[PDB]
Every structure is written in structure tokens, then in C-alpha cells.
Design a protein around this ligand. Structure first.
Ligand SMILES: [Mg+2]
Ligand SMILES: [Mg+2]
Lengths: 277, 277
């Protein structure tokens, strides 16, 4: 009755993806310290499931909802709250810049940062293995890569898989090797795509060779088991969770609400492989 | 007022550990399908934090609490609900067998299963790298290993780290190699302990050699990047989540409550390395 539950909804695809769980982990920790209960609802990245998760959280009267939406930004479902005190804050994937605050990545800047450091290696063959070129995220990462290499004299091969997947990249990378030599510099826009070339580089060269510079999005601590140079960008998961919660709490308790639009948070570049020494 | 919130508390250390998040992921999915909201509270494995997480969930009137407790089983905190309709179901780590149902592992059976399959390799040097021998879990896994090797003629070296850690095993394994040769069969009770020997086997042999049979608890999909035989046991995370929720819902809605005590769920043995082919 015009009160609050001191609870926050969080709609994400699942509690499996390495990146979403890390942010949820810090989000839960920082919210409980502030006296808020997180109400996690997993959509499995399906639109119909997400919209039901939103309505169930509303039924439980959460004070706000943090959502990583599977819909287009101005899909009309979220426009229901376009001019509404109820705070809906987008995470990772953006809502309408006009009416919602979204904490998102800086994929173009991240890729230029990651590509530039890969350009430091003077390798002759360079491969850019990506996926789903028609997606805005794929384009931004490609635009960032090309910006770092606009004046580099080397030809860069661009190879796009049809899904951000392990086995998909594996068979794409093998047919590509029937026609070209193995690259001396590799650039993957997803760490799953890098797994795919491994199952080829294992099934072909037996080992994984050195004298090969890898740059990738995502990150594993098992990237340190690589004797070749490996560069990698990963989200500042706890900075992102902090910023999201700042926006939620500011929308709830403070007179001048946060302004709508995108707030981007850069990734950190980590030096794996022989680089770590 | 004698009703229900249709919500379940889940107190775990964090949403970071690979194993707890997987179970929470399936627990959330199966509970939302049944109309229950999960209220996750992370204790960071600290007793004072866990007891506060329990009281905050009680303040929010959850119908039941699933807890992976950091306390001893008959620590008197949970005895407050020893003869109480309110359901408290233990996960991973057990509560008092007399008053609570606990869904726990089968570490002794799992280790005998994992050790037996390692005994199939006829290697000469066998190393058992564990941690914290005074813990009941450590003892059970050692007892299971020794049961599979009671009549095997090979000497098994037993090497205990002082913490289930990556760098801790690394320096322990190096000093141990100043005195012994590198094993041809390896047995780790934690996948973090196996990382530790890697940072030695990388810093010493440069590569990671083959002709070496590894058996480990835990599991990674990046265990498939190993050209040596690697056996590994991991929890059936979704079976465990199913059983836990069955017990919670049976305690809440059905006349004859579930009986207290331990229900153990075996791990699955997965064949990684060259075995996967
Ligand atoms: Mg940086
Ligand atoms: Mg099995």
C-alpha cells in the first residue's frame, strides 16, 4: 500500500553463463549489504519466457527490475513503462535510449583496444574469426578491429561462423584450412569460437603450436595453459554490478532520477599465455 | 497470516563456484515452473553471515530454506528448527541426520569409482594429491581410493596440501619433485589442486607430457585440451536440484513429511583428454 518490498528483480537468461553469474554474484552481495533482496528470474533468452518473468516479478511487487532483455530495444513490451516511476534498468543488452538507463559494454572500444595489442605482433597471416555479422555487436567489434588496423599493410582474412558456438567454428575453421595456411595471428570475437579452432588445431597439428598470437573476447583461467601468446578482454563484472545498483537505488530513493540512455563500461585486457610471466 | 509466499530461500556461499551456480540454475528453473520464487542469499561461507542470511529470509517469510551450511552439523543454531514444521533442507553439506534431510555427495563411492578406473592404467609411479586430511570429506575420498587399490602391488605416494588451492598445490608439488620423479598416474581430490601441478608441469617440462593418467574430482570442458588421459567426476547438478526441490515441496504440501537423514547422489565419471575420442 504505497510502500516497498525492498526487493529487486533480475531477469537474465540463466545462472550458467560465466559472465551473467559473476555479475549476479556481486549484485546479490552489494544488494544484501544495502538491505535489498534480489529476485532472480531466468528467461532462457526466450521472449515469451522473459515477459512472463517480468509479470511474475511485478506480481511479487519488486521495487525495480534489472533485465538483460532478449527483445529488440524498442520492442513495444517495455514501452509500457516508458513514462513511469517504476524503475527498469537494462543490463548488457540495451533498452530504448529515450526512456531507460542501460549499463552496456563498449564492444567497439574493447575490440580496438584488443586488436591494437594484437597488431604489436608482426605475424604475416592474420585471421578474424567472428559470428553472425548482421548483429550490431558483431559489427561494432569488427569496426573496432578494423580501426586498429586501418594503416597496417597486412591482409586480414575475415571468417564468420553462423553461430557463436564451439563446434560451429570447428568445422568452419577446418574447411578454411583446406584453402589457406594456419594463421600466425588469430582474433576471435567469442571465447567459444576459440574453442572451436582448438578442436581443429588439436585434431590437425596434434599439439597446439606456438609462434601464434591469439586475441579473444571473454576469458578463462585455463587460457593460462597456453604456451603461445594469448590476449583477452573480460568484463569488470563487479564495476558493472555496482553501476547497475547505483542506478536502481537512485531511481528509487532520490528526487532527480538518473537520466535515460547508455552508460558503457570498458573491458579489462588480460595477458594470458606466456605473456603472464 | 497462516498462508504462504510461495518462495524458497537458498543460502549458499556464492554465485561464483561452478558447482553451486549450476545447481542454483536448475533449482531456479524447476521452482519457477512450479510457481515458487527462489530467494538466494550468499553467505561467503562465513558462519555469522550465514546466520544473518537465515534470519533475513525468515523475516521475508520464505516457506522453506535450502542451505549449504558452513557450520558443523549439530551446531546448535539449526537445532532451533529440530522439531518444527518449517522445512530446512541441507545441500552438499549435511545437517543433523536426526532432524533434517540432506542431499549430499557420495565422496567415498565416487573416489572408489574414480580410483578403480585409474587403476586400469598400468603406470609405475602413482601420486595421490589431496588437501586438509583431517576433514571428513578428505578422509572419505582417501578411503574410497584405498579401497580400489587395496590389492594393487604399486606403492601410492600420499601428498596433502594444507588448503584446496591452486598455488598451494603448486609449491607443494614442486618440493615433492625435488625428492621424487614425476608420476605416471595422478589423482587429485580437487580440480584446483590439479591446476597447481600444471603451473609446475608447465614451469618444469615446458609442455605437459603424455604417458600420464590423471584422475580428478570436479570437471572442466577445458580438460579436453589435454593430450594425456584424464578421468574426472562431476556432480549430476540437475538431479541434485530436482531431489532437493522434491524434498522441499513434499515437506510443504504433503501429509507424511520426508524422513530426515542423508540422501546421497553419485557423481558421473567423464572421460576427458584423448579418452574422449
Ligand atoms: Mg586494462
Ligand atoms: Mg557414470
Amino acid at each position: 500500500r504505497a510502500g516497498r518490498t525492498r526487493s529487486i528483480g533480475l531477469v537474465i537468461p540463466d545462472l550458467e553463463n560465466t559472465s551473467y553469474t559473476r555479475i549476479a554474484n556481486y549484485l546479490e552481495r552489494q544488494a544484501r549489504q544495502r538491505g535489498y533482496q534480489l529476485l532472480i528470474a531466468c528467461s532462457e533468452d526466450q521472449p515469451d519466457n522473459e515477459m512472463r518473468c517480468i509479470e511474475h516479478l511485478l506480481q511479487r511487487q519488486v521495487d525495480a527490475i534489472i533485465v538483460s532483455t532478449s527483445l529488440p530495444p524498442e520492442h513495444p513490451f517495455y514501452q509500457r513503462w516508458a513514462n513511469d516511476p517504476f524503475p527498469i534498468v537494462a543490463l548488457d543488452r540495451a533498452l530504448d535510449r529515450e526512456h531507460f538507463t542501460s549499463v552496456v559494454g563498449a564492444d567497439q572500444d574493447d575490440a580496438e583496444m584488443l586488436a591494437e595489442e594484437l597488431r604489436k605482433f608482426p605475424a604475416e597471416t592474420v585471421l578474424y574469426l567472428g559470428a553472425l555479422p548482421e548483429l550490431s555487436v558483431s559489427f561494432l567489434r569488427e569496426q573496432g578491429f578494423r580501426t586498429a588496423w586501418k594503416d597496417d599493410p597486412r591482409e586480414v582474412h575475415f571468417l564468420y561462423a553462423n553461430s557463436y558456438e564451439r563446434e560451429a567454428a570447428a568445422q568452419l575453421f577446418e574447411k578454411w584450412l583446406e584453402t589457406h595456411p594456419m594463421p600466425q595471428a588469430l582474433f576471435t570475437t567469442s571465447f567459444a569460437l576459440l574453442q572451436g579452432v582448438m578442436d581443429v588445431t588439436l585434431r590437425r597439428d596434434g599439439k597446439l603450436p606456438s609462434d601464434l598470437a591469439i586475441a579473444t573476447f571473454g576469458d578463462n583461467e585455463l587460457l593460462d595453459f597456453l604456451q603461445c601468446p594469448v590476449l583477452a578482454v573480460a568484463q569488470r563484472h563487479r564495476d558493472v554490478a555496482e553501476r547497475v545498483l547505483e542506478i536502481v537505488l537512485a531511481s528509487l530513493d532520490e528526487p532527480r532520477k538518473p537520466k535515460p540512455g547508455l552508460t558503457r563500461i570498458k573491458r579489462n585486457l588480460y595477458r594470458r599465455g606466456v605473456l603472464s610471466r
